[PDB]
Amino acid sequence: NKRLIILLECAIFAAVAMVLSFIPLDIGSSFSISLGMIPMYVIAIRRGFWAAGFAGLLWGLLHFLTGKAYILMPSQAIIEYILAFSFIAFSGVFSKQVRSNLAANQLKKAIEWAWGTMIIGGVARYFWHYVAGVLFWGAYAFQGWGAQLFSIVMNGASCLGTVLVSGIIISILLKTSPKLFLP
Amino acid sequence: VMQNKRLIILLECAIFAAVAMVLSFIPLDIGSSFSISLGMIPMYVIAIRRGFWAAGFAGLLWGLLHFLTGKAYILMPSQAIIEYILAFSFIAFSGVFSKQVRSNLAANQLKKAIEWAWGTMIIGGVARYFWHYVAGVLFWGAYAFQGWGAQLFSIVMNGASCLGTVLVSGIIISILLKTSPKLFLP
Numbered sequence A: 001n002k003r004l005i006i007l008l009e010c011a012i013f014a015a016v017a018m019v020l021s022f023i024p025l026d027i028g029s030s031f032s033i034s035l036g037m038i039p040m041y042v043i044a045i046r047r048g049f050w051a052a053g054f055a056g057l058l059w060g061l062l063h064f065l066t067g068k069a070y071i072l073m074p075s076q077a078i079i080e081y082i083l084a085f086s087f088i089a090f091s092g093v094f095s096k097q098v099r100s101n102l103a104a105n106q107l108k109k110a111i112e113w114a115w116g117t118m119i120i121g122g123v124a125r126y127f128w129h130y131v132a133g134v135l136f137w138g139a140y141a142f143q144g145w146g147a148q149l150f151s152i153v154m155n156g157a158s159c160l161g162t163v164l165v166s167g168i169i170i171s172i173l174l175k176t177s178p179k180l181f182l183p
Numbered sequence B: 001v002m003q004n005k006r007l008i009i010l011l012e013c014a015i016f017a018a019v020a021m022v023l024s025f026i027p028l029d030i031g032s033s034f035s036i037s038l039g040m041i042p043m044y045v046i047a048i049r050r051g052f053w054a055a056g057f058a059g060l061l062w063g064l065l066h067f068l069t070g071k072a073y074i075l076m077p078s079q080a081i082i083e084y085i086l087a088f089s090f091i092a093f094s095g096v097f098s099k100q101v102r103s104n105l106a107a108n109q110l111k112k113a114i115e116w117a118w119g120t121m122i123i124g125g126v127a128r129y130f131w132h133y134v135a136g137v138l139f140w141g142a143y144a145f146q147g148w149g150a151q152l153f154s155i156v157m158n159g160a161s162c163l164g165t166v167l168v169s170g171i172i173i174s175i176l177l178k179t180s181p182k183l184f185l186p
Ligand SMILES: Cc1ncc(C[n+]2csc(CCOP(=O)(O)OP(=O)(O)O)c2C)c(N)n1
Pocket: A021, A029, A030, A031, A032, A033, A034, A035, A036, A070, A080, A128, A129, A130, A132, A133, A134, A137, A140, A150, A151, A152, A154, A155
């Protein structure tokens, strides 16, 4: 029953996220808007912290199976497609608050809590992308840029752009489809 | 080779992950739901020595090594994922107070260094055993005592396992801060 259902929902939203990953919003190899965070955000709100991590990791592991995983070195694939996607769990730190306000028709308060949990969950993921950027992606930097500088700026931009476009759509989905976040 | 700081830190993570995997072959278990993980001792050293991200990388390496060495108890593909990848990745939080420990240890403030160390060891331990508790509820409900639900059995057993692990590992680390300060100070 419930155990199978919650696990399946994680797998479904992971699959949807993997599908959205085939929609390229990239500028080079260091900037990209991850539309797959949209299914991650709803499942994080709908089910909570642990579910967002499991679903997130499934999404990361699906990169390997679908061949969408950039692999410079074995270490870097471990950090970027497993560690980083596991910390999507933090997208559900305010899931109870969002669901609480959403069910009580406090949509404004629900959206505000939603942006709080989408930013934390976003930064939590891209932290590991920033780490791997310094360790592995130095040779892709601009002319005269260090590995750390190139990593914080590019991963910061990717994080900023990703949370922004996903946050807006989530906000609309909170307005248009409340039951999607309320199981 | 020793001038490449990035390669060294990665190697150190691999080394401590290997040492933790060896300690995982030391059975301090009572049944299948209680165990004192001695492998958290090297995980705590590297966490203090190198910080948050290194602890998570080393922890995950330790977690993955369970598959290669056949030490992973796999009930379902989804629980193996949660317990040997998610749980071991959250050992990163063993390094939330790494700077404080090293800062006090270098200033010869041993008492304060140990106090921060215990804080960073408790948080890191809880961060890992959270996922063991989650999997305990989701999967390990059939190994419970008679009359015990999945929730009850998981919070008590994983709580005790976490308690026993943090206590034993914490004391060993506390002594190593006294006897071997340079081990935590790169
Ligand atoms: C400076 C820098 N450049 C490039 C990378 C590589 N990188 C950034 S995000 C990422 C994860 C995949 O990104 P994306 O194309 O958004 O995958 P999605 O989640 O959308 O499926 C990787 C491998 C990095 N970690 N750091």
